[PDB]
Amino acid sequence: DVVLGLYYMTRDCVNAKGEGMVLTGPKEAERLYRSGLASLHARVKVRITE
Amino acid sequence: LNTCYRILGLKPTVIFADQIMYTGFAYAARSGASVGIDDMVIPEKKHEIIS
Amino acid sequence: KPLVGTGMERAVAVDSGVTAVAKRGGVVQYVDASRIVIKVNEDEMYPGEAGIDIYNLTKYTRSNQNTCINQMPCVSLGEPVERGDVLADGPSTDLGELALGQNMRVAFMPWNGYNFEDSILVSERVVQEDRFTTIHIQELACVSRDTKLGPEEITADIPNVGEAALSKLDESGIVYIGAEVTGGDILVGKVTPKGETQLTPEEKLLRAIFGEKASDVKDSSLRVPNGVSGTVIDVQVFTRDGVEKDKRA
Amino acid sequence: FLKPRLVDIEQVSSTHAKVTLEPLERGFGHTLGNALRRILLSSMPGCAVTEVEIDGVLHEYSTKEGVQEDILEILLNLKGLAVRVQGKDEVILTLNKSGIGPVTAADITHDGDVEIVKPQHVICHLTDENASISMRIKVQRGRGYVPASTRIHSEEDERPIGRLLVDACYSPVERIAYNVEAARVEQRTDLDKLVIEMETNGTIDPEEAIRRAATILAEQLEAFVDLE
Amino acid sequence: TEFLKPRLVDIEQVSSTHAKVTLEPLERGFGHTLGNALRRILLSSMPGCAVTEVEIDGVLHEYSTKEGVQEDILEILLNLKGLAVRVQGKDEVILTLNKSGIGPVTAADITHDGDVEIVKPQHVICHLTDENASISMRIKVQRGRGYVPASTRLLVDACYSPVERIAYNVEAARVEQRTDLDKLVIEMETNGTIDPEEAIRRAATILAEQLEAFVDL
Amino acid sequence: ARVTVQDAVEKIGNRFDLVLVAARRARQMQVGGKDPLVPEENDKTTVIALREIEEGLINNQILDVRERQEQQEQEAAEL
Amino acid sequence: EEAVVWDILDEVIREHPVLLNRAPTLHRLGIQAFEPVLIEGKAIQLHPLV
Amino acid sequence: EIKELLKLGDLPTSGQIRLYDGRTGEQFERPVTVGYMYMLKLNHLVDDKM
Numbered sequence: 001d002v003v004l005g006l007y008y009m010t011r012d013c014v015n016a017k018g019e020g021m022v023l024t025g026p027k028e029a030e031r032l033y034r035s036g037l038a039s040l041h042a043r044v045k046v047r048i049t050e
Numbered sequence: 051l052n053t054c055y056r057i058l059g060l061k062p063t064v065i066f067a068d069q070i071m072y073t074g075f076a077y078a079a080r081s082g083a084s085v086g087i088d089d090m091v092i093p094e095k096k097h098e099i100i101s
Numbered sequence: 102k103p104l105v106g107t108g109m110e111r112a113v114a115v116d117s118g119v120t121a122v123a124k125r126g127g128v129v130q131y132v133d134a135s136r137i138v139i140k141v142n143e144d145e146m147y148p149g150e151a152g153i154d155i156y157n158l159t160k161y162t163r164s165n166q167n168t169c170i171n172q173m174p175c176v177s178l179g180e181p182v183e184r185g186d187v188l189a190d191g192p193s194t195d196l197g198e199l200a201l202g203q204n205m206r207v208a209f210m211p212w213n214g215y216n217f218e219d220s221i222l223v224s225e226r227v228v229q230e231d232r233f234t235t236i237h238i239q240e241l242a243c244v245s246r247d248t249k250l251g252p253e254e255i256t257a258d259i260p261n262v263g264e265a266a267l268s269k270l271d272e273s274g275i276v277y278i279g280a281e282v283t284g285g286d287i288l289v290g291k292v293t294p295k296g297e298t299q300l301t302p303e304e305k306l307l308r309a310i311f312g313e314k315a316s317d318v319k320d321s322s323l324r325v326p327n328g329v330s331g332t333v334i335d336v337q338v339f340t341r342d343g344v345e346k347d348k349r350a
Numbered sequence: 351f352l353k354p355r356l357v358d359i360e361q362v363s364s365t366h367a368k369v370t371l372e373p374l375e376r377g378f379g380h381t382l383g384n385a386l387r388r389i390l391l392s393s394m395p396g397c398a399v400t401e402v403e404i405d406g407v408l409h410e411y412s413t414k415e416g417v418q419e420d421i422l423e424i425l426l427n428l429k430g431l432a433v434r435v436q437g438k439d440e441v442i443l444t445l446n447k448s449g450i451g452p453v454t455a456a457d458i459t460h461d462g463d464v465e466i467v468k469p470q471h472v473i474c475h476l477t478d479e480n481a482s483i484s485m486r487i488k489v490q491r492g493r494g495y496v497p498a499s500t501r502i503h504s505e506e507d508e509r510p511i512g513r514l515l516v517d518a519c520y521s522p523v524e525r526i527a528y529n530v531e532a533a534r535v536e537q538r539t540d541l542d543k544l545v546i547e548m549e550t551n552g553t554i555d556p557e558e559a560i561r562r563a564a565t566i567l568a569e570q571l572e573a574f575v576d577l578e
Numbered sequence: 579t580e581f582l583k584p585r586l587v588d589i590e591q592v593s594s595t596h597a598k599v600t601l602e603p604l605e606r607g608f609g610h611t612l613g614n615a616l617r618r619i620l621l622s623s624m625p626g627c628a629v630t631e632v633e634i635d636g637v638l639h640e641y642s643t644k645e646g647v648q649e650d651i652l653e654i655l656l657n658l659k660g661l662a663v664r665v666q667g668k669d670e671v672i673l674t675l676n677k678s679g680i681g682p683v684t685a686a687d688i689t690h691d692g693d694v695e696i697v698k699p700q701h702v703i704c705h706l707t708d709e710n711a712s713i714s715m716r717i718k719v720q721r722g723r724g725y726v727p728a729s730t731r732l733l734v735d736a737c738y739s740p741v742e743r744i745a746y747n748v749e750a751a752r753v754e755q756r757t758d759l760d761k762l763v764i765e766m767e768t769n770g771t772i773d774p775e776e777a778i779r780r781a782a783t784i785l786a787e788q789l790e791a792f793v794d795l
Numbered sequence: 796a797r798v799t800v801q802d803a804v805e806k807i808g809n810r811f812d813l814v815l816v817a818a819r820r821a822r823q824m825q826v827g828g829k830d831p832l833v834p835e836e837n838d839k840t841t842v843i844a845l846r847e848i849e850e851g852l853i854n855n856q857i858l859d860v861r862e863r864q865e866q867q868e869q870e871a872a873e874l
Numbered sequence: 875e876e877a878v879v880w881d882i883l884d885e886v887i888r889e890h891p892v893l894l895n896r897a898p899t900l901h902r903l904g905i906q907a908f909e910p911v912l913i914e915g916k917a918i919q920l921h922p923l924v
Numbered sequence: 925e926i927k928e929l930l931k932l933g934d935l936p937t938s939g940q941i942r943l944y945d946g947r948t949g950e951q952f953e954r955p956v957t958v959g960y961m962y963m964l965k966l967n968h969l970v971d972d973k974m
Contacts, residue, residue: 001211002071002922005078021729022656027743027767035621036950037727047656060801067923075214079945082954084209086940087926103962132477134413134420160420161411166967174418178450178477202964208943209957217922229495229519231426233965236411279408279511328971330499334411351723351784355791376724381618382788384949385611392607395579493579565793566581570612571786573586573601574779578790610947755877757914796889796909839889916974 009040016042023047102195103204110198117199119191121172124154126183129176135160137174137188145184158189161334163238168192203232239331243289243323250294253321255347257290260316273349276333283330289323351375352535354382358545359557364467365524365549367556372533372543379530379544386546387526389563393493394554396520397435399428400501401488403513410514416481419474425516427473428487431455434553437463439491445473448482458487467552492520522554581605582759589775595767597774602751602761609760613746616764619781623724626740626771627665632658632717633732640732646711649704651732654715657703658734661685662770663719666693672718675703678710697770740777742767797838803848807855813848816855820844823858887912894920 018038023029023046032038051070055063103110114120121137125145130153131138139154146152158172174189175196176182187197194200205227215222227233245253257267257274266287269280274290276282298315300308308314325331338350358370374382402425406414410422419427435441441464447457453476456469476483498515526548533543550556568575584601591597601612632655636644640651665671671694677687685701706713722738744766751759766774800813807813823829825840832853833846847853891907899905906924913919927937940955 001078001214001217002074004083004211005074005076005081006070008081008083009077018727018729021727021735022652024656024660025742028737030743031621031725031737031739034617035725037725037730061799064799071214071923075211075217078211079213080948080950080952082210082943082952082956084940084954084956086938086955086957088938088940104960105962132418133416134418135415160413168967171420173420173423177418177475202962204960205963207959207961207963210943210952214922225495231517233963235965235969277511281409328974332409332411334409351787353791354788375623377618377622378788380949381615384946385615388607388611388946392605393579393581491579561793564789567611568786568789568793569581569583570604570608571782572583574782575786578783578786607947614948798909837888842889916970 011041012043013041014043016040019043020045025049102198102200103202106198110200114191114194114197114199115185115187117191119170119172120187120194120197121156121158121189121191123182123184123186123188126186127154127181129178129180129182132174132176132178134158134174137176139182139188156188161238163240167237167239169236169238237331238334239326239329241288241323241326243291243321245291248293250296253291253293254318255289255291259287259290259292259320259322260318261320262287271349273347275336275338275349278333278336281330281332282325284325284327286325287322288325288333291321291323292318293321295319352538352541354378356557356560361556364552366547367550368545368547369556369560370543370545372541373535374530374542374544376540376542379528379542383528383530383544383546385567386560386563387528389567390523390526390548390559393566394520394522394559394562395491395493396522397433397489397491397553398518398520399431399433399487399489399516400518401508401513402428402485402516403510404483404485405512407514408512414481414483416476416478417474417483418477421514424474425514427471429516429519431471431473431487432467432551432553433489434465434467435463435489435491441489443487443489445487446482446484447476448480450476450479450481452476453483490518492518495519495521521551523548523550523559525549591774594773595770597766599764599766599774599778600761601764602759603753603756604751604760604762606758606760609746609748609762613748613762613764615785616778616781617744617746619784620741620744620766620777621725621739623784624739624741624777624781625723626738627663627719627721628736628738629658629661629663629734630718630720630726630736631732632715632734634713634715636713636715638732644711644713646707646709647704647713648707654704655732655734657701658717659737660698660769661701661703662697664695664697664771665719665721666695668693670718670720672716674714674716676714677706678712679706680708681706737769740768740771741774742769797842797845800845803845806848806851812855813845816853816858817841817844817848819858820847820853884912894918 016039018032019042021038021042021044023032023044025047029038029044029046033040038044051063051067054066115122123139125139125141127139127141127145129137130140135158137156137158139156141152141154158174159170161169161171164170170192172189172191176188182188187194190196212222243255245255247253255274257270257272259267259274267290269276269282269286270290271277276286276288282288294317296317298317300315336349340346340350352373352375354371354373356369357372358368361367371382404414404421404424407421410425412421414421417424441461443461443464444459445457446459447453453473454469455466455471455473457473458466474483496518498517501515501518526546528544528546530542530544532540535541546560548556548559550559582603582605584604587600587602589597589599604612634651637651640655642651644651671691673689673691673694675683675688677683679687682702683704683706684699685696685703686699687703704713720736722736725739726736728735744764746765747763749761749763751761753759764778766778768774768777772780800810803817804810804813807816821840821844824831824843831843831847833843833850835843838846844853887910890910892910893905893907895905908921911919926939930937930939938955939959940957942951943956943958944951
């Protein structure tokens, strides 16, 4: 179930809600999904600090 | 996991795996990820190939 | 009954002696949780004798695997019944159909890893409704036999016990019928004669101080197995020949 | 932040009912109803049977001459007996009935403070002419599901063996579902109205239910509240 | 019927912009009750100030170019979203950036309007190259309760949510003899407009005022 | 709840010797031997010994030093 | 089964590893030590990753 | 025939409906198969094993 959930997360589909938009950080990605605005498979590009 | 262990070490990798499990379980739960009788799609060509 | 069966349930619940099938057709004369009296038809009865067909149902008898086998009538008063119709369902039988389990509303989806490998996530309602509850019956016997120190006794008088324990025994020392007990409780009080007791002088000091004298008998008792808590439904007493019958016997 | 109020209250069946709160902000239907149902499905006063003593019987696993219903099935029929009490908490009923015919739940002699929401229920069927049954039902108030096994720890010295404990299930509500759709306020573009359809047992009225749900919900915030 | 009333057990804070809260003992499911309620409120509806829409004087396009900037328009648009503004009793305001110097453009290089405040004075809004590269954009901020995306309203995404992230977990609560009780743990980050404590209590107050048409003594 | 002994193993060569030294220190603490060199924090004797190993204020050499000195601590009680 | 003993149990189990063993022992990983977490019921809870 | 019997019962043809989590209330994406199965309780009770 772990790998299944992770594979569902990392999956991407074209035209997902909010695809192509930009986010300040991962926190905003979480806030966008859990709010029903953005999906989890959108091809969005965001800023991350590695 | 292997790269995390052989880069950061044991202590980070333990909690890393714990978090992987904690997140994967909940996400697979809220994803639904069911199986129906329609999910198995037979090829329409199969009839002709078999014949 | 199984929601989705194969039709063979009738061919099993009937051919197995767990059920009760009518010998001769007729009309139910008397319905009871214990017995069933069927008024046979005029054309299916013998010429010389009665009359009716009487069936004595089995009620709460211990099985081989310590489970419970019981027969429940599935027909009410004054009802027509041909031959081959089930009069009473036995264990795991519904109106003559074999029913080995329960109908459950299942949904295929992971849930916080609570069904990770093959684990099963069950709702609290299922355990509420007692539809998966199982009634088991255990047989445990206390055996009083002759020893070197003398024949054992079933007397309720036991050393090293409190009054709260012996409260549940009769004058002869046998658990009262119907009284529910749990592990550790004494069902049949028995005392095996033991002798030549020797005491560390530290214990003889106690014997002298508090005047609590030692006993010349050990303790073997039919106590409820640890972990299980049931209710006494039957008590049997086998007395040898020549041994005087006690009150409970 | 317009404060919500209940509007539509129509109880169709003796058990089924519906309630509604229109004045919600955007996306408050879920927030409010998913918590109201969690409050209802767990915390309601209710009333249920705890102790039962049938006069001829000693334990649940047995039969009685004349009655085609096993004592076990009798007790299980007693667990589904709906009742409502107001004055007291401990109340003992008296059930004495003889003669052939199914013994309905209306054969219980009424007590100063008791009511039955469905007398058409059935305790057991009697197939004998002279068979008579005398049983004293002990009913009381509580909250949630309390099985009998857990109950024997305080133990109150129950003396006579003929007292049979039954699993207590205090649960006035049986089911809840909630929907939300925009019913326009006088001056608002889109506001979500919440409709909670429900299935009760007939004991607790659908209004006190939601009011006590609000009670038990707001009480949890007492860590940070004085009065509003 | 009485109930089990919880008291605050402990409070922990990693920093000023992050905090954790614990509440026990609770009742079965009550953990999730309050967790889901407060999480919904904080994620989807909250009274706070943000920046809505911003145009530029150089070029009017979200994907166009710029003379003398080592970044691209979309990046500055994003950076505007990050600015944390704590506005006083004024309804709204629209300011402009005046900076032609050489170096990074901080959040302190703005027009200081009457009643506006910034918690991140060193917030970088752009990177400016050498000699001049004149640039003076026009930023417009507004009020609101929640998160309003840009494509649903240049176009910028206005996040009035004072919180950046919220989470809740339920685990076993050790009590006197109670077998299974819930223990609620809330974790939240804010963007600087307000610390998590008062925001948590503000959410609780929103819920309670919603319920104030109700129960009893 | 010392989940991993990594840092404790870093101070002593063998993963085995760690057990011996920690067991000697835990003998000292559990039995009436001594008092801990770190705040107890309610952790058991074993974990306190492991934490002392982590701090670097306890190992085989130090325990031997203290025991050898206490050898002479009892040779002065004879006047 | 006095209440006072339960706390005592919590005191004695704290930081006391227990060895868990699967019936068939093919290799040394067939036995591993865990930190006990007191639970009700008669079923033993096992970690999925193991 | 199963599809027909589902049609008569005012139930979906695919045999899949939507489910809402009781803790959150938000539906699960990707419809979940539900129905009725016959479950058997085996004699391998834990009361006789622990």
